[PDB]
Amino acid sequence: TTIVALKYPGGVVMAGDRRSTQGNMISGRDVRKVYITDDYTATGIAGTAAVAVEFARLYAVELEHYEKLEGVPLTFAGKINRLAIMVRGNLAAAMQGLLALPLLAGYDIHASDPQSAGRIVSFDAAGGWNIEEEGYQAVGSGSLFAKSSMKKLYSQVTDGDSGLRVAVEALYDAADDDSATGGPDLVRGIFPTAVIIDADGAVDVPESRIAELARAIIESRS
Amino acid sequence: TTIVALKYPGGVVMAGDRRSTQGNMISGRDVRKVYITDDYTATGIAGTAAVAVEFARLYAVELEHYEKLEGVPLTFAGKINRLAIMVRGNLAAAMQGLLALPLLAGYDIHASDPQSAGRIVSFDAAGGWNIEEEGYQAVGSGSLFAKSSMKKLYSQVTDGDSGLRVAVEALYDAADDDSATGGPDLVRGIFPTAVIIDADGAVDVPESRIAELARAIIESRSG
Amino acid sequence: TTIVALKYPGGVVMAGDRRSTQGNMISGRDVRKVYITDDYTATGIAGTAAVAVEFARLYAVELEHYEKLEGVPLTFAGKINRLAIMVRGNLAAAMQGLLALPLLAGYDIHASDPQSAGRIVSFDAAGGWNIEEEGYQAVGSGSLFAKSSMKKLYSQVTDGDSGLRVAVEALYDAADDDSATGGPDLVRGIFPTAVIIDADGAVDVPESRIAELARAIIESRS
Amino acid sequence: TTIVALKYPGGVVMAGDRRSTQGNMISGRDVRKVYITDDYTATGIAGTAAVAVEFARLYAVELEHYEKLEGVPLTFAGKINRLAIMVRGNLAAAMQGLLALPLLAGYDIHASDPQSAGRIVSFDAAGGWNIEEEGYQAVGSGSLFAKSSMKKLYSQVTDGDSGLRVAVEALYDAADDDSATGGPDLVRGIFPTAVIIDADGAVDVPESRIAELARAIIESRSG
Amino acid sequence: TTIVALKYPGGVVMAGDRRSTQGNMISGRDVRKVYITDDYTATGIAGTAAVAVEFARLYAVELEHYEKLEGVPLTFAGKINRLAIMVRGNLAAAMQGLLALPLLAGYDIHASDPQSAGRIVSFDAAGGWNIEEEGYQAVGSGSLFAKSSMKKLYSQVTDGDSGLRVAVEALYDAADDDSATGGPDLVRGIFPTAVIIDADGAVDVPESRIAELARAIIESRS
Amino acid sequence: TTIVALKYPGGVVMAGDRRSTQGNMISGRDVRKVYITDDYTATGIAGTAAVAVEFARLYAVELEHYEKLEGVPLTFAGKINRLAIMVRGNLAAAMQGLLALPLLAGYDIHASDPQSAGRIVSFDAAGGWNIEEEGYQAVGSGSLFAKSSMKKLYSQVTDGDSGLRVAVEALYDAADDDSATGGPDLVRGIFPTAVIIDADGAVDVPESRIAELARAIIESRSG
Amino acid sequence: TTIVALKYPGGVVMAGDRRSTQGNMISGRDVRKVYITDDYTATGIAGTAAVAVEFARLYAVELEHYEKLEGVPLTFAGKINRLAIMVRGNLAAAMQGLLALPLLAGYDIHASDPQSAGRIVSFDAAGGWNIEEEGYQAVGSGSLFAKSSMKKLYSQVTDGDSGLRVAVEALYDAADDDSATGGPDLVRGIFPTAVIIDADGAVDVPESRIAELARAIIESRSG
Numbered sequence A, C, E: 001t002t003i004v005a006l007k008y009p010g011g012v013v014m015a016g017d018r019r020s021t022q023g024n025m026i027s028g029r030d031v032r033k034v035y036i037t038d039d040y041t042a043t044g045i046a047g048t049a050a051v052a053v054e055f056a057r058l059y060a061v062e063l064e065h066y067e068k069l070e071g072v073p074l075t076f077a078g079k080i081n082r083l084a085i086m087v088r089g090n091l092a093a094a095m096q097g098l099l100a101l102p103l104l105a106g107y108d109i110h111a112s113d114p115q116s117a118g119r120i121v122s123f124d125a126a127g128g129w130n131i132e133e134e135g136y137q138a139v140g141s142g143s144l145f146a147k148s149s150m151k152k153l154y155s156q157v158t159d160g161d162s163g164l165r166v167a168v169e170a171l172y173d174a175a176d177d178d179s180a181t182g183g184p185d186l187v188r189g190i191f192p193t194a195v196i197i198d199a200d201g202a203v204d205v206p207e208s209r210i211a212e213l214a215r216a217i218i219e220s221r222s
Numbered sequence B, D, F, G: 001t002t003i004v005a006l007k008y009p010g011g012v013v014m015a016g017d018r019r020s021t022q023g024n025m026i027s028g029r030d031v032r033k034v035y036i037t038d039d040y041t042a043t044g045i046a047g048t049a050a051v052a053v054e055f056a057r058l059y060a061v062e063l064e065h066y067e068k069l070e071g072v073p074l075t076f077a078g079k080i081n082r083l084a085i086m087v088r089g090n091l092a093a094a095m096q097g098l099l100a101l102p103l104l105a106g107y108d109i110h111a112s113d114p115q116s117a118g119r120i121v122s123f124d125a126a127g128g129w130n131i132e133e134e135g136y137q138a139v140g141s142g143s144l145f146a147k148s149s150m151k152k153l154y155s156q157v158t159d160g161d162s163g164l165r166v167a168v169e170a171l172y173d174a175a176d177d178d179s180a181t182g183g184p185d186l187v188r189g190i191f192p193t194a195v196i197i198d199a200d201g202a203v204d205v206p207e208s209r210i211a212e213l214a215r216a217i218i219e220s221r222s223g
């Protein structure tokens, strides 16, 4: 698994691969790991599939639950604290093999500057968290390759489209060096999934755009 | 990790590094470990990140909770006892790897002499505490280097600025001998965080003065 | 520890960091990890210091021993096999904590094409080896970060100078993300060690050149 | 145990404390831990007493053995390699509790400049070694405190005597923060042992000189 | 740690050293291990600092609690029983390393003879206790050296001052043979703490007198 | 530890030594191991001191409690069952090292023959018990030696004094072969404690009397 | 077990108790633990009986063997080194429970000053040794009590007789606080064994003098 998220002027982008494995065997090619959990936040999770899906689902339910009960959504800090408390809740099972780590990307509608309102938060198995001031982050077995790629490709990020490109290329390098992360399947037409979040909210990036960016990277490398 | 705190005439200073690690890997460069827990108290914590942040947050809430309920803040002894009780509460989990040790620095507004009203209190995993009557203390994987540096540099502390400088220098020696402690990152402009507390209260030291003290020490060591 | 090696047109370069650690504690700043083992080969080793220096020293002695006994040096394949057998000999102790992995860089004087006579060979704890065809390779606790940096910077290698620059930059990224790898110490003036090898043999790169490249990289990043 | 060694202009100095312990119990007050191993090298050992003394004894015998067999002393590098091979020989017993680490101080008569001919070499349990070019080094349970003291006191080293003072003061700080390291006993008149090495060879520092330096340090610390 | 207590005609004395250790490291020089627990009782504790201080504090609270609730202080036997029950309560934690043993010194205001009203009680980790008639007792890592010293010096005890001296000298021998016990620090001016208890109650011995006696013994041995 | 009890015509006697040990170290010389638990019953206990005293105190309280609640003391069988249930209750702690075994001696006022009203009951760590129909019994680390001595000396028991004597002599042989059992300390004047019980109740034997018997035995052994 | 040795003007004295135990059980009252190993050295050993006596026997044989082969006895340093090497050889078995530590007292015929020619050397399980300058030393389960007693009684040592008295009194205090060490048995007439060594050699001290000193000490403590 590899999930990337990066800040661009006025927004954030998050993308994740599509592969599911049981040991060395490939058990899935179309799996979705990045979910829109609220109008201004997306979550991508790596680890045991059952645990990850329950995380995303229950988290979305918790945020909207608070919103309907109290008439206003949580502050971003609140969203972070709730996700952290959930992650730490799972620590016992994680020590027994049911480990799952999330990566949170959001747009803080209450931020001062609408261009640096993007937010990227990473978490550890004990619920600790860090708000990323450096612009990008990743999670999963390929996260090191993706972070190290984005370290070199990040200067090219000037808008949402260049940022999406850099994200997909980071996933490309991750899948290049990690067998548990799946690259773009040009035969089956399966590509990473991506979500973009700006002042207008969070929207799923269409499959075709990701396809074009993939083929562009592939032919750039040949 | 290294957190240092020292008393200067009429106040106390506490500063902490910015590095977060998973084993040998550097997982963070901007992490904040020193928090103002109440108008006259700051706490810096070392150890598992999750437990450290939960400690600081819950502790701040506990103090102010008492203050709003009873109309007066806790005595400093009370603050000490509460932090200790919290740590001892965590001892069981700590023995399973979730260890976190705090260091408390405060200004006792009810003390007899406002010159020596500074307080530095250290803790162990079992809830033990020591009120330091020798002027400085540190906690974390680099704490020994920082204490031994302050042992030689402490005689130079006469003002808030000299004390702050000695603190950041202690963190410098710590980062010099401990890879788990982050030194000043001059490329990214990331420096230790510091909080100073005197009779006027507790304030975060502005980043600029820390950068100036860092770059000053770095230049001071280059021949 | 991080040791890097890359091929450039007509030669090969190898560089290594200078840090020695005992757990979290820094026990050395001037440590040398890359050794010229013969007129046309250098070896860099990662792991337990005692075992690493013992490997380098014993290996150089073994190569020159064969050379004086039989009047001609070993073929490069032979040098590879002997280093491999040494690593495989240490496997038992390696499982008990005395692990050391080598990285071999050489210039094959018997190669057909002299512009591609550079050789980079990597090893595993069981004595397996691979002659690296992609131009670069690394070993050590920061090797993943350095490989991912070279993956992006390798297009810039056209001579010995650009290749050396890329090597030092890879070590810079390694030290940037790995606390067990030491970066350039501008206060003490301690920089990585490097060895460069071409048709004229293997020579130590003078420290002042590595330094100039270091400041170039740092400055480039501010 | 704490053994310190530092380079001074034209020579090297090595000193060690006098305490022997069984856990918390003090089983010795006068033990000698720094030995003259040959005309131009001294060795100090920390760890299990039996293994430490056997190290020093056997090592001296081995060096003089080579000298008598081949008519010339070993090169300094050769001396290093032999001590290292010995330690690595003890690795297994060290894993079972009989650990002993040496610290080597010497004067290389074949060095280029007779000014920086001092040599200080440290070792690890597996036989690894480091030639220390930063001028000072220590080994033992108090080595971190002593190293951190010398890091601040080293600029005062300008001759053999200032270096000797800095050695004794480092051992003082070590004993100050480490209970397994013994400080100067003014009641019994027992002080650290020292060896000085220059071009004229290695000689024991006389007890009276060290006593003077110790008392100066003590009464300097009591105002 | 070493805590000593001895009976003198018409009273009792208790003294304790000032050192705090973490293994071999000295983590404290000024700690106080002897506490006045009520107008006629003092307690000194050895072992884990946290447990020791909580013992002294909670014990004082318990005694004064009974006194205010029922209008009369506990009988000495009662005080003994409560301290014992506390120590027994801690047995499990002690078995996992948080061991702390107290030593109790008091003046029994209800005693038959007002000259033998001093009381010294020792405890073990399981809540057992012994009322000491041999006249002296000690606890801590140096307790054997101090007891064996007092066995020889006790005949010199005839009043409060001779008894205090003998106590400080016992602590001197304790610190002399035990690295976990601190002797008098003439540089910092830190000396053992002592409490004296007679018919007028329990009062802290001023630091000046203990310092004088410590110097007398030191210069007596040189 | 050694506690003995034996029946004589019209009564029962129980005696115990005075030594307390922590491993090989002697931690007590004046200790008391035999307690009068009610007007007609005494208990002697061996094992961990804390558990033993808790047994004696709690047991006495339980018996007198029943007596005040129901207006009549328990039958002897009932007392037996209560001690048994207490001992069984302690089984878990006993496995983990807090072992304590009692020996019960009493005078049954409801017996048919007032000369055979003496009772001796022994217990095991799991609460099993046996009423001793043979005149003597002992418990503790020297219990085997005391039993083997009484096996040879029991023929001489005809009254309270002869029985008391055989008892003290059994304690003498026990202390003679077991270092955890203390013999008579003629220097400090510390002797075993004894309790005698007849139709007139249970009384402590005065220290002076046992002293006389000890000296008598010692003289008999010197020829 | 307790073995003591102390230097007196011009000689050395060693004495040891007579008790042998299997755990808490006393399996011996007459054992000898101090042996004359050569004309000028005696050794007393504590620990497993089999290993201890084997040490004494084998050591005596080794020394006399060297003397007959080479025509001259070993230097004292040589004797120490051989005893230490033997102890070290036993380390493996010792960690398996067959531990035995010796204590060596001798008279060095090659010493400069015949008044300070007495030598007392102690050993640990790994073969380490210390030559005792402090004047006295002991080994065994009661060694700490005996050493702490001699610490107060040593000023009274002025000749062989005062030294012997101080040794016996040390063994008395050791046996007073340690159950594995036997005190003087006045009923059986068994007392510690002692050996005295001066320029005329090493001789067994006659039992009568030890008995006289024992009764003197006993009366001194019983008013």
Ligand SMILES: COC[C@H](NC(=O)[C@H](CC(=O)NOC(C)(C)C)NC(=O)c1cc(C)on1)C(=O)NCc1cccc2ccccc12
Residues within 6 Å of the ligand: A001, A019, A020, A021, A022, A027, A028, A031, A032, A033, A045, A046, A047, A048, A049, A050, A052, A053, A097
């Ligand atoms: C590191 O481990 C790899 C992990 N693999 C896994 O998590 C696999 C999931 C799997 O293959 N299931 O089979 C089907 C349902 C697809 C047919 N666990 C297990 O097989 C498993 C776990 C336990 C316990 O027993 N079996 C993974 O693929 N993780 C990626 C992932 C992330 C977010 C959402 C996902 C949803 C579905 C599948 C994968 C998802």
Ligand SMILES: COC[C@H](NC(=O)[C@H](CC(=O)NOC(C)(C)C)NC(=O)c1cc(C)on1)C(=O)NCc1cccc2ccccc12
Residues within 6 Å of the ligand: A122, A123, A124, A125, A126, A128, A129, A130, B001, B019, B020, B021, B022, B027, B028, B031, B032, B033, B045, B046, B047, B048, B049, B050, B052, B053, B097
């Ligand atoms: C265990 O000693 C090292 C410790 N490391 C840590 O505490 C790390 C924190 C971490 O790496 N998180 O990664 C993110 C959140 C940045 C993505 N825990 C763990 O890796 C961990 C432990 C268990 C169990 O599961 N995970 C540390 O560096 N501690 C330093 C530290 C001290 C005070 C406040 C802090 C606040 C935030 C981060 C760090 C802080």
Ligand SMILES: COC[C@H](NC(=O)[C@H](CC(=O)NOC(C)(C)C)NC(=O)c1cc(C)on1)C(=O)NCc1cccc2ccccc12
Residues within 6 Å of the ligand: C001, C019, C020, C021, C022, C023, C027, C028, C031, C032, C033, C045, C046, C047, C048, C049, C050, C052, C053, C097, D122, D123, D124, D125, D126, D128, D129, D130
């Ligand atoms: C195990 O990863 C950390 C490793 N460190 C080490 O390997 C250290 C070396 C060390 O610190 N020694 O201290 C002094 C006295 C030499 C200064 N060994 C040990 O700590 C060690 C291993 C055993 C067994 O016992 N001790 C390391 O830094 N390795 C890097 C390294 C690679 C190649 C050549 C080197 C030569 C010298 C020093 C380091 C070298």
Ligand SMILES: COC[C@H](NC(=O)[C@H](CC(=O)NOC(C)(C)C)NC(=O)c1cc(C)on1)C(=O)NCc1cccc2ccccc12
Residues within 6 Å of the ligand: D001, D019, D020, D021, D022, D023, D027, D028, D031, D032, D033, D045, D046, D047, D048, D049, D050, D052, D053, D097, G122, G123, G124, G125, G126, G128, G129, G130
């Ligand atoms: C490792 O822990 C501390 C170490 N202590 C020690 O090593 C002690 C020494 C000791 O007390 N011996 O007692 C006699 C010889 C005095 C009777 N042995 C053991 O604890 C020991 C360990 C095993 C196994 O067997 N014995 C020490 O103090 N070491 C300091 C030291 C360093 C160099 C040379 C020395 C020579 C003599 C004495 C000490 C020396």
Ligand SMILES: COC[C@H](NC(=O)[C@H](CC(=O)NOC(C)(C)C)NC(=O)c1cc(C)on1)C(=O)NCc1cccc2ccccc12
Residues within 6 Å of the ligand: B122, B123, B124, B125, B126, B128, B129, B130, E001, E019, E020, E021, E022, E023, E027, E028, E031, E032, E033, E045, E046, E047, E048, E049, E050, E052, E053
């Ligand atoms: C291991 O037995 C030794 C024991 N040491 C200790 O108890 C030390 C005390 C300590 O160093 N704390 O650190 C600060 C707060 C001083 C900075 N804790 C621990 O070793 C410890 C235990 C666990 C679990 O985690 N840490 C001790 O010194 N005990 C002596 C002692 C007795 C009575 C009252 C005391 C009060 C304060 C300090 C000491 C006191």
Ligand SMILES: COC[C@H](NC(=O)[C@H](CC(=O)NOC(C)(C)C)NC(=O)c1cc(C)on1)C(=O)NCc1cccc2ccccc12
Residues within 6 Å of the ligand: E122, E123, E124, E125, E126, E128, E129, E130, F001, F019, F020, F021, F022, F023, F027, F028, F031, F032, F033, F045, F046, F047, F048, F049, F050, F052, F053, F097
């Ligand atoms: C375990 O067999 C030996 C046992 N000894 C003991 O039980 C000792 C007693 C002791 O030394 N206490 O300290 C003071 C209060 C005396 C200073 N505790 C322990 O060994 C002990 C056990 C645990 C757990 O922690 N400590 C013993 O001697 N038992 C004999 C005994 C029997 C009946 C009543 C007694 C009353 C007081 C003392 C002893 C008594």
Ligand SMILES: COC[C@H](NC(=O)[C@H](CC(=O)NOC(C)(C)C)NC(=O)c1cc(C)on1)C(=O)NCc1cccc2ccccc12
Residues within 6 Å of the ligand: G001, G019, G020, G021, G022, G023, G027, G028, G031, G032, G033, G045, G046, G047, G048, G049, G050, G052, G053, G097, G098
């Ligand atoms: C376990 O530490 C105590 C030790 N006791 C002992 O060493 C006892 C001696 C013993 O009782 N043997 O029984 C006979 C010989 C009387 C039949 N061995 C054992 O208990 C033992 C150990 C193993 C293994 O198997 N048996 C001891 O008493 N040591 C004292 C001692 C020291 C020097 C010379 C001695 C000579 C004879 C007897 C004792 C001597």
